[PDB]
Amino acid sequence: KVFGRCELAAAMKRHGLDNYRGYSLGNWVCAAKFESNFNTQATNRNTDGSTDYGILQINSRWWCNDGRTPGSRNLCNIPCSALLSSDITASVNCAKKIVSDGNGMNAWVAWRNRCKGTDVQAWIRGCRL
Template sequence: MMSFISLLLVGILFPATQAKQFTKCELSQALKEMDGYGGVTLPEWICILFHSSGCDTQAVVSNNGSTEYGLFQISNKFWCKDNQNLKSENFCDISCDKFLDDDLTDDMMCARKILDKEGIDHW
């Protein structure tokens, strides 16, 4: 009984990061405002995100000496800052862990910057 109460208190004091594994339908609803941005259609975004992150906001992948975070697989090399790469350019001016929750607002903001600077071939 005592360990249950301790576990309950830990769960209350340290809530889990809210993450989401999107279905393609949920993702198309959440990314409506990305439709057509930079000439990229919503079905293209869905396809890109399905293949890069599996539509999982907690996806973290090591790739050629950098780490990519979240749904859009945003790299710590240029776009965000983490504890692994303190010399990141951090063009999106954000901590990489912000891409691991279910709030896609900052993810989409950074994805637009990447698209403006690198184009869709970045993904």
């Protein structure tokens, strides 16, 4: 499923991402935008045998189990396939665990490089949730 910007903003706000660990809603929309382009089926295999899954490109080395990553931890305690759902709950809950870890959203490189320090409120602008 390819969420629209505003449709995705409302789901993330509805899932309590707004100002979660101090990160306003635009940050999460922006991170989704440059991680996956709002696509819940987005995948990205790395050469180390890890793969990035779903709308926030969560990596199977640390966070989820795909059972084919020699890493590997499952710190969000979920299957990586749950992160490819058109329901964003599993991605959002795993994101909350990651962002709580003191790296914060710097965990997401696309957010560091594309979103961080920018006017992220732009992303929720023209939605009105």
